[PDB]
Ligand binder design. Sequence first.
Ligand SMILES: [Cl-]
Ligand code: NI
Length: 129
Amino acid sequence: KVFGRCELAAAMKRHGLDNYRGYSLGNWVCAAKFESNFNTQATNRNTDGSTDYGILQINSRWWCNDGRTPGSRNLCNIPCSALLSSDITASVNCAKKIVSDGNGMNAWVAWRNRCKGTDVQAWIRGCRL
Ligand SMILES: [Cl-]
Ligand code: NI
């Protein structure tokens, strides 16, 4: 599924991401835009052989099992394919674990490079939330 901006904002809010660990909703929408272009089916292979999955490009070395990443820790205890669903629940639940892990949203390179320090509230402007 390719989400619209406000549609995704609403879904993330309902799943409790607004101000989760102090990160306002715009941060999460901005991260999803630049990680996946709002596409739940996005996948991208990394140099180390791991793969990133879904709307928030969650990595198979640490967080999910895709059966081809040796030494995967599967900390979200889910197959990576579950992160590609039209239903973003699994992605949100896993992302909550990631952002609690110590470096906050810096875990997402696109967030650090393209969202951090910017006017992220622009990402939810005009939306009926
Ligand atoms: Cl933080
Ligand atoms: Ni990545």
